[PDB]
């Protein structure tokens, strides 16, 4: 047996003046896609939905690469118009993995803003404001149930100006309530890049 290859289901809309979920794929044409690794639907934007067989998460187009976390992915390879790509990146210490990223996706550019309010989207296009707390940490201003943030990893924290902070990668959790989340700074991006 083999293992499929992640495959893009939908994306986070953040185009327009409303930030808004998108499915574009169904269930089994992601299990027949993940199978293959032909995808030939049309990518759009800077956050996709991704799925395997057994998870769904999130992945963020960051100079050009489409950024998910090792936990997610695994070394997976991405389903595509010609067939399963295979990772440009595979770190298993910073739980990060990349592929090049899709034609018709769009970027997010690096901050360089110096500035400690963010903004993480989820999977459900929620924008949730967080303080930077360290290099790696920030804390939710309004904290949320576990059950909230599953299935985000692998989404981007964002500047007020709109450039990557970081990719999110564990939720720092008290009895089931988040009050903080880690992620992985865009440094360590820039450097792996
Ligand atoms: C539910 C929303 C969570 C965001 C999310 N991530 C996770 O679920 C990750 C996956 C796993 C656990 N974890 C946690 O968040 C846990 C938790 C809440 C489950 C209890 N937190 C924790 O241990 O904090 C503790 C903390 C000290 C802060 C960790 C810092 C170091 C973190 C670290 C550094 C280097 C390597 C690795 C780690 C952690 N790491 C590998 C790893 O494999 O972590 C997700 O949404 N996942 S998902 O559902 O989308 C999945 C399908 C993809
Ligand atoms: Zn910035």
Redesign the pocket.
């Known amino acids: 047996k083999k293992k499929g290859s992640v495959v893009i289901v939908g994306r986070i809309n953040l185009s327009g003046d409303t930030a808004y979920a998108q499915q574009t794929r169904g269930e089994e044409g992601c299990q027949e896609t993940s199978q293959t690794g032909r995808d030939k639907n049309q990518v759009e934007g800077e956050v996709q939905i991704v799925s395997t067989a057994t ?4 992945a963020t187009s960051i100079n050009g690469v489409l950024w998910t ?4 992915a695994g070394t997976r390879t991405i389903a595509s118009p010609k067939g399963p790509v295979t990772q440009m990146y595979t770190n ?4 990060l993995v990349g592929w090049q990223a899709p034609q018709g996706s769009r970027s997010l550019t690096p901050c360089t803003c110096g500035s400690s309010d963010l903004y993480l989207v989820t999977r459900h296009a929620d924008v949730i404001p967080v303080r930077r707390r360290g290099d790696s ?1 920030g804390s939710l201003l309004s904290p949320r149930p ?1 059950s909230y ?6 989404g981007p924290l964002l500047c007020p100006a709109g450039h990557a902070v970081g990719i ?6 008290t009895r089931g309530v ?1 009050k903080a ?2 992620f992985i700074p865009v440094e360590s991006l820039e450097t792996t890049m």
């Open positions: 998870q769904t998460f999130l976390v090792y936990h997610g298993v210490d910073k739980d940490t576990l943030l599953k299935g985000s990893s692998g999110f990668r564990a939720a720092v959790s988040a989340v880690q």
